[PDB]
Amino acid sequence: KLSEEQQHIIAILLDAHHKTYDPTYADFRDFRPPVRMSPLSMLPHLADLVSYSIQKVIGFAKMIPGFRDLTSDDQIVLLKSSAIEVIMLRSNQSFTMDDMSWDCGSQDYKYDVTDVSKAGHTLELIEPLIKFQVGLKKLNLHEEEHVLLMAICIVSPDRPGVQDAKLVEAIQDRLSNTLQTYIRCRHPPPGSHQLYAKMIQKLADLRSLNEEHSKQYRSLSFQPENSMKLTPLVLEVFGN
């Protein structure tokens, strides 16, 4: 049932993820240092982390089958709308339920809810974000399902500003059908039970997390003292 082209799609996405996700986290040494001390002491470090991840998300998106068939405008709007969501998805690889933290190789680069608070965010975002990470971790996705979900997240036709919604739909449908068939043929029960529906539910969760993050980002970025600590890429992609 899993066609040769569907296996090809999965192979491309696995390779794309391997070329854009560094599990050694070596580049974190280039970021402005984390500081745990009212002041948004983790904002510089986490802004560099997010900016770095945006670059990785773009590199992954460019390798999604069909993505470069879109216009420059549509590629841009899809990445602007999806970047925060793909960051939340891909960060799940470092997330551990042992202590509900994003463990990136060392104590300095191990992040918890208090670190996100020290970048300016509130429980309105942080609690649903932790529950998302826990719920996504509990799915115990195969790597194949993880990279397919990230690709589907990016190529969604209902994003604000999409021009050629039908072409975006055709690209996503190819990935969605690849994912649905992968689960049917490669994911053994009981883990496969309603797995596609649960994964699409996580995409809905991400839209809500996206909305709340943008709300808080807009309020944080509205203060020039905070925007001064962001990066040029973050300002371009996230806003202002």
Binding site: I58, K62, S72, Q75, I76, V237
Partner: peptide, 11 residues
């Protein structure tokens, strides 16, 4: 607006 950094990363 204009997105020169995203455009550049998209090649």
């Amino acid at each position: 607006k204009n997105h020169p950094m995203l455009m550049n990363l998209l090649k």
